[PDB]
Amino acid sequence: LPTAQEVQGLMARFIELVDVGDIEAIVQMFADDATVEDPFGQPPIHGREQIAAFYRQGLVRACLTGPVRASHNGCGAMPFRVEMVWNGQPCALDVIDVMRFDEHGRIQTMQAYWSEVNLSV
Template sequence: MMDTQLIRRRMARYVELVDAGDIDGILSLYADDAVVEDPVGAPALTGIAAIARFYREGLGRAEVSAQLTGPVRVTGNGCGAMPFRVDMHWNGEPCSLHVIDVMEFDGQGRIRSMKAYWGDLNVERRPE
């Protein structure tokens, strides 16, 4: 059985690192051969180089804040899910993006798969 508390802490840490804009910190959570699908349905990004490019070209060029909006849920077999919100500017407008990330972890507690569930219906405009 995997360490469920470790997974819970790593997932919460992921949101903290997104909030801080710490791309290197985010990347350190991933396995070298990880796969990211953000959002689900987009082409999968495989390997740390592709994942690094995704974060540097997205998060690295935006001013965002992030916070958990509910508890992290963890299974005993190395998987977890969490709801969180990312506040940012979308098409020049202040918006909040409501996301659920589902992650699978390897035996060393590194993310081997991340799927982000969100779409246009999950973006809401915020007052300035």
């Protein structure tokens, strides 16, 4: 189980991969049975391919907007901003990903909180 410090490291690593757009590298960070709920409120996405599909569908710039809050039970929450093009126009989306990592430092749970209210032009 990653330590509070390792969680900070992994979560930041995740943002870096989304930012560069390395789907393969992003997918590899997920445990086998990892689930993704993005946005939180919608059906969880399960499986390597579906997740890769989800990220390819999505990937865009992403960067932390605050430090990773990490716990001692391999979990963490981080605030970030996604820069993308929507309705043919440059937009921003504020998100908070809550993640639970496993013993191998792989992502078991990803929950991204955000909705239209967090959408900005």
